Design a protein around this ligand. Structure first.
Ligand code: HEM
Ligand code: HEM
Ligand SMILES: C[C@@]1(c2ccc(F)cc2F)OC(=O)N(Nc2ccccc2)C1=O
Lengths: 75, 53, 48, 106, 378, 111, 53
C-alpha cells in the first residue's frame, strides 16, 4: 500500500489549477475535440487497421469458396 | 453517567441541529412513501392519483 | 415462445430514454470533477 | 571514414525514433526505460540537475497522456539532440551486478 | 484524525477506493477491472434469484427455467440479465487481458498470475452454468468439454466417469454442476480480493509504461466518477442485449430439451469459447488437440518470460503494435472458424490461424521487442 | 481536515460560550494593539483612508457586543459555506489534498 | 540470462541437495502409491496383498 507523502522526490515544479465551478466542463468540445480524434486516428491507423482488413479478406474469400465448393457441375 | 450531556452548551447544540434532524426526517418519510408506493399518503397527493379505479 | 415480448420493448423504450438523459448527465459530472486536471498548467523553475 | 551505409543505418534508426513517438511528449529515450532494479539504482545515482529534469519530463508527458494531447512540433525532441544521460550510470550498475555474479560462481 | 483513516474496517475501504494514489493518465482500458467486479455482483444477485426457482433434476430442469420466464414475476429479465451478464463478463475479461498484454501490466507477476486463475475459474463457472437449463447445447456441450479429460494418459477414463458420477452426463452430473456453479463465484470473489491486494503493493500501471509516482491523483473523486460512467456504459450494453436482442448470442438448440440419443448436426460454443474450440479441432489427434486447447489459455502464464523489450508498454513500439493487432485479428479469425463446420477452406485456415497464434506469442512478439531495442541502440 | 471541520462547525453549530471567548479575545487584542503613539498614529492614518472617520473604541465595543452565536453562524455561512477557496502551497506538498477534496471540505453532507 | 547459475559453487550446492531431493521424491512416490491404493506397485509389496482374489 502506497500513500501520499511517501511516493517520490519532486523539486521545482509549479502546478496552477482552477476550481470546477470557475470553469467549463466541455471547453471547445467540437472545435478542439474533432481535430484531436482525427490526429489520434492518423497516429494509429497503420498499426490497427491492416490486420483487420487481412481478416476481412480471408473472411470474404473463405465464405465465397465454401459456398462454391458445395456445388457440382458434371457427373 | 449521561448527566455529562446536560448544560446550556448542549441545549444550544440541540437547537442548531433540530431544523436539520427534522428535514432529514422529511427526506426519510417522503423516501419511504415513494419507495413502497404507500396507499394512505399517496391517495391524498392531488397529482399522483394514478390508480383512480 | 415469448409472452414477455411487449413488456420487454416498453421497458426497452424506457431504458433508452433514461440512458439518453443519464449518459450525458453522468458525463457532465465526470467532466466537472476532471476539469481541475484537464486545465492544469505546469511550470518548471530549477535554480540558475 | 564511413559515409553512405552509416547514414542509411542512421536513417532507419531516425525513422523508428519518429514512429516510436515519445518525442511528441517531450520524452528522451532514457525517460521511457522500464524500471527494474538495475534501472532504479541508475536513477538513484543521477546528479541533482538530471534527476529533476527527468521528473519534469515524465510529469509533462503523463499530463499530455491524460489529455491525449502531444507537444507542438517545434518542441518535440530531435533524435540528434537526444541525450543518453542514464546509459553510463546504467552500464556501471550492470558491470557491478555482473562482478557480484562472477564472485558468487566460484 | 479522521474516522475514515484509522477505523479498522474503513481503513481498508480508504486505502482501496478513496485515498489510493492513482496515475493521472489511466485510460478507458483501466475501467474493466471495476466492470469485472460489477459483472461478478450482477451474476451473484440475478443468479441467487434464479436459484430461488430453478430445480436441478433432469425431469424438471428445463421446466423450472421455463417457469422463471412465463410465471415468476419478472423472471425473464433476471434470466436474461444473467445469460447476457455472462457474455458481458467475458467481453470485460478479454478487454482487461488485452490491456495487460499491450501495456506490459503482466510485469506485476503475482497480480497477473492470479488473473490467469481468475480466468480459468470464470471459464469453469460459465461452462457449468450453461449445462443447467438442460437444453440440447447444454447436454452436448457438457459431453464435449467433460470428455476433454479422457485424453489424459492412463487415468483419463477414471477421471471423467468420476466427474459424471456414471457412464455419461446424467442425473448425478447436473446436480453436481448446480452445487459447483453456486460455490465457485464466492471463491472467485475471494481470489479477486487477493488480486487487488497484490495490485496495491505497486498501484496501477499506465498507458506510457513509465512510473507515475511524480503524478498521482486520489482515486476519489476522479476514478469513482470515471468508474460510475463506465458502469452506466456496461448497463447500456447489457440492457440492449436483454431488452432488444435476448436470443442474439444464444443457440436455438438450447430451446429444444436435452436429447441423450441425438446430437445437433452443427454443435458450436458460445462466442467467447470459439477461438479455443478452433485450436482444439485444428489437430488431427485426440491428445494433441486438448493439449493445444489447454496451452492456448495457459500461455498467458508464460507471457512475463517472453518480455524482451527495454520498454514496459507498447505505446512507443510500432512493430509490437502491428504484431499485437495481428494477434487480435488472428483471434477474430479463430472465433469465426470456431463457429463454422469442419469442411474445405475452414480446416486449413483454422490450422494456419492456430500456428500463427502460437507464432505471434512464442516467437514473433519477442523478436519485435529485440529488434526495437537494437533500433533504439539499447 | 481539522481546519475545515472548524469552519464547518462554526457555520452550522457555533455555541454561545465560545463566541463570548472570541468576543473577549478581540476586545483584548484591540486594546493591547492600540498602546503606544505608533500603533494609534497608524490607526488614525489608515482609518481616515479606509473608513473616512476614526471609529472610536466604544463603537468597536458596541459592534463586538452585538455578535452572538446566531451572528457567528450566519456570517460564517455567507463566506465559508459551499464556497470556492483559494489555495497556495509551497514545499514538501505531496500530501496536500487535491483541490476537489479541499472544495468538498467547504460543505457538510450531514447539514 | 540463466548463465548466472553456472559455476563450481552452484554444482556443489546441487550435490549437497541431491540426496534430499531424491528422498523427498521417495516420500512423494510412496505417498501417491498409498493414497490411491495403486494396483501396479502394491501387488508387488510382499505383505499388503489384501486383494488376493
Ligand atoms: C474475476 C475477473 C477480474 C477482476 C474482478 C479483476 C479486478 C481488477 C481490478 C479492479 C483492477 C484495477 C483496475 C484496472 O486496472 O482495471 C485490475 C488490474 C489488473 N488485472 Fe485484473 N481482474 C480480473 C481478471 C483479470 C485477468 C483475467 C487478468 C489477466 C490474466 C488480470 C490481470 C490484471 C493486471 C495485470 C492488472 C494491473 C493493470 C494495470 O495496472 O495496468 N485481471 N484487476
Ligand atoms: C453464485 C452466484 C450464481 C448463482 C447462484 C447462479 C445460479 C444460476 C442458475 C440457477 C442457473 C440456471 C438458470 C438459468 O439457466 O437461467 C444459472 C445459469 C447460468 N449461469 Fe449462473 N449463477 C451464479 C453466477 C454465475 C457466474 C459468475 C457466471 C459466469 C459469468 C454464471 C454463468 C451462467 C450461465 C452462462 C448460465 C446459463 C444461462 C442460460 O443460458 O440459461 N453464473 N446460474
Ligand atoms: C458456455 C460453454 C463454455 C463456457 C466456458 C468455457 F470455458 C467452455 C465452454 F464450453 O459451455 C458449453 O457447454 N458450451 N458449449 C459447447 C462446448 C463445446 C462444444 C459445443 C458447445 C459453451 O460454449
Amino acid at each position: 500500500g502506497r500513500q501520499f507523502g511517501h511516493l517520490t522526490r519532486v523539486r521545482h515544479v509549479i502546478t496552477y489549477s482552477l476550481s470546477p465551478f470557475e470553469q467549463r466542463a466541455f471547453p471547445h468540445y467540437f472545435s478542439k475535440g474533432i481535430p484531436n480524434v482525427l490526429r489520434r486516428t492518423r497516429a494509429c491507423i497503420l498499426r490497427v487497421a491492416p490486420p483487420f482488413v487481412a481478416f476481412y479478406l480471408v473472411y470474404t474469400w473463405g465464405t465465397q469458396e465454401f459456398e462454391k465448393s458445395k456445388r457440382k457441375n458434371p457427373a | 453517567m449521561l448527566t455529562r450531556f446536560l448544560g446550556p452548551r448542549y441545549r444550544q447544540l440541540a437547537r442548531n441541529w433540530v431544523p436539520t434532524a427534522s428535514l432529514w426526517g422529511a427526506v426519510g418519510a417522503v423516501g419511504l412513501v415513494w419507495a413502497t408506493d404507500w396507499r394512505l399518503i399517496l391517495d391524498w397527493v392531488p397529482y399522483i392519483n394514478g390508480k383512480f379505479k | 415462445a415469448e409472452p414477455e415480448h411487449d413488456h420487454r420493448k416498453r421497458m426497452g423504450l424506457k431504458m433508452l430514454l433514461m440512458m439518453g438523459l443519464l449518459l450525458p448527465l453522468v458525463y457532465a459530472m465526470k467532466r466537472h470533477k476532471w476539469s481541475v486536471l484537464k486545465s492544469r498548467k505546469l511550470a518548471y523553475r530549477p535554480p540558475k | 571514414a564511413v559515409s553512405a551505409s552509416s547514414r542509411w543505418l542512421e536513417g532507419i534508426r531516425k525513422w523508428y525514433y519518429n514512429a516510436a513517438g515519445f518525442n511528441k511528449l517531450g520524452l528522451m529515450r532514457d525517460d521511457t526505460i522500464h524500471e527494474n532494479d538495475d534501472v532504479k539504482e541508475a536513477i538513484r545515482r543521477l546528479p541533482e540537475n538530471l534527476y529533476d529534469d527527468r521528473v519534469f519530463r515524465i510529469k509533462r508527458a503523463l499530463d499530455l497522456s491524460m489529455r491525449q494531447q502531444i507537444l507542438p512540433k517545434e518542441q518535440w525532441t530531435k533524435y540528434e539532440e537526444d541525450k543518453s544521460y542514464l546509459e553510463p550510470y546504467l552500464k556501471e550498475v550492470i558491470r557491478e551486478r555482473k562482478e557480484r555474479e562472477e564472485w558468487a560462481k566460484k | 484524525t479522521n474516522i475514515r483513516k484509522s477505523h479498522p474496517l474503513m481503513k481498508i475501504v480508504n486505502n482501496a477506493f478513496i485515498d489510493l494514489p492513482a496515475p493521472s493518465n489511466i485510460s478507458s482500458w483501466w475501467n474493466f477491472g471495476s466492470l469485472l467486479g460489477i459483472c461478478l455482483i450482477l451474476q451473484i444477485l440475478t443468479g441467487l434469484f434464479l436459484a430461488m426457482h430453478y430445480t436441478s433434476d433432469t425431469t424438471t430442469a428445463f421446466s423450472s427455467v421455463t417457469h422463471i420466464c412465463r410465471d415468476v414475476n419478472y423472471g425473464w429479465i433476471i434470466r436474461y440479465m444473467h445469460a447476457n451478464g455472462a457474455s458481458m463478463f467475458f467481453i470485460c475479461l478479454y478487454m482487461h487481458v488485452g490491456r495487460g498484454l499491450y501495456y506490459g501490466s503482466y510485469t506485476f507477476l503475482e497480480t497477473w498470475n492470479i488473473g490467469v486463475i481468475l480466468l480459468l475459474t470464470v471459464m469453469a463457472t460459465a461452462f457449468m452454468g450453461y449445462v443447467l437449463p438442460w437444453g440440447q447445447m447444454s447436454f452436448w456441450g457438457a459431453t464435449v468439454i467433460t470428455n476433454l479429460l479422457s485424453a489424459i494418459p492412463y487415468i483419463g477414463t477414471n477421471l471423467v466417469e468420476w466427474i459424471w458420477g456414471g457412464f455419461s452426463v446424467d442425473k448425478a452430473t447436473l446436480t453436481r454442476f448446480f452445487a459447483f456453479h453456486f460455490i465457485l463465484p464466492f471463491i472467485i470473489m475471494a481470489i479477486a480480493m487477493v488480486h487487488l491486494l497484490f495490485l496495491h503493493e505497486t498501484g496501477s500501471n499506465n498507458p506510457t509504461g513509465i512510473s507515475s509516482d511524480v503524478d498521482k491523483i486520489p482515486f476519489h473523486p476522479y476514478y469513482t466518477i470515471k468508474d460510475i460512467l463506465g458502469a452506466l456504459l456496461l448497463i447500456l450494453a447489457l440492457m440492449l442485449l436483454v431488452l432488444f436482442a435476448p436470443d442474439l448470442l444464444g443457440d436455438p438448440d438450447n430451446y429444444t430439451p436435452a436429447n441423450p440419443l441425438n446430437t445437433p448436426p452443427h454443435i458450436k460454443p458460445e462466442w467467447y469459447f470459439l477461438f479455443a474450440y478452433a485450436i482444439l479441432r485444428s489437430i488431427p489427434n485426440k491428445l494433441g488437440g486438448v493439449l493445444a486447447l489447454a496451452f492456448s489459455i495457459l500461455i498467458l502464464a508464460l507471457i512475463p518470460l517472453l518480455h524482451t523489450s527495454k520498454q514496459r508498454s507498447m505505446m512507443f513500439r510500432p512493430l509490437s503494435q502491428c504484431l499485437f493487432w495481428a494477434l487480435v485479428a488472428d483471434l477474430l479469425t479463430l472465433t469465426w472458424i470456431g463457429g463454422q463446420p469442419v469442411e474445405h477452406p475452414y480446416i486449413t485456415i483454422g490450422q494456419l490461424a492456430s500456428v500463427l497464434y502460437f507464432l505471434l506469442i512464442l516467437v514473433l512478439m519477442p523478436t519485435a521487442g529485440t529488434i526495437e531495442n537494437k533500433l533504439l541502440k539499447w | 481536515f481539522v481546519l475545515q471541520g472548524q469552519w464547518m462547525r462554526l457555520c452550522t453549530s457555533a455555541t454561545e460560550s465560545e463566541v463570548l471567548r472570541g468576543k473577549n479575545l478581540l476586545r483584548n487584542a484591540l486594546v493591547s494593539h492600540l498602546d503606544g503613539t505608533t500603533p494609534v498614529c497608524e490607526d488614525i492614518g489608515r482609518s481616515l483612508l479606509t473608513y473616512g472617520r476614526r471609529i472610536p473604541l466604544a463603537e468597536w465595543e458596541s459592534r463586538i457586543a452585538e455578535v452572538d452565536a446566531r451572528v457567528v453562524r450566519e456570517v460564517c455561512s455567507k463566506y465559508f459555506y459551499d464556497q470556492c477557496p483559494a489555495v497556495a502551497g509551497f514545499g514538501p506538498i505531496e500530501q496536500l489534498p487535491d483541490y476537489n477534496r479541499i472544495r468538498s471540505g467547504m460543505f457538510w453532507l450531514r447539514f
